[PDB]
């Protein structure tokens, strides 16, 4: 099944934040309405924040997270969770190798902001 794709409310600001846990350099691409809105590139094996940004979901609210290492797309797992019918987390994990820890790049999207 498709992973890393989320429908947000339109014209809504959200935060996106990436952590790294891999010897491989993680390239995180955040697409809004099928076009890149933010790109993070970093390397860490201890959960360093390689990027964080406030974006606007725009006209249709489609948000997609892509992760690649040395040009190879990682395998993604994702889900969205809503607390007290108001606070939203869209979660992404990714695996770039064979140990299947799926933490090599971890991306957390949260809204609303402000």
């Amino acid at each position: 099944a498709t992973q890393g794709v989320f429908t947000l409310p339109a014209n809504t600001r959200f935060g996106v934040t990436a952590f790294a846990n891999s010897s491989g350099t993680q390239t995180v691409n955040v697409l809004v309405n099928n076009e890149t809105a933010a790109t993070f590139s970093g390397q860490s094996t201890n959960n360093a924040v390689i990027g964080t940004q406030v974006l606007n979901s725009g006209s249709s609210g489609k948000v997609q997270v892509q992760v690649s290492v040395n040009g190879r797309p990682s395998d993604l797992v994702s889900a969205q969770v809503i607390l007290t019918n108001e606070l939203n987390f869209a979660l992404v994990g990714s695996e770039d190798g064979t140990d299947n820890d799926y933490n090599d790049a971890v991306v957390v999207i949260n809204w609303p902001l402000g």
Binding site: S22, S23, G24, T25, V69, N70, D96, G97
Partner: peptide, 5 residues
């Protein structure tokens, strides 16, 4: 540990 090295 192979993704780079």
């Amino acid at each position: 540990k192979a993704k780079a090295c």
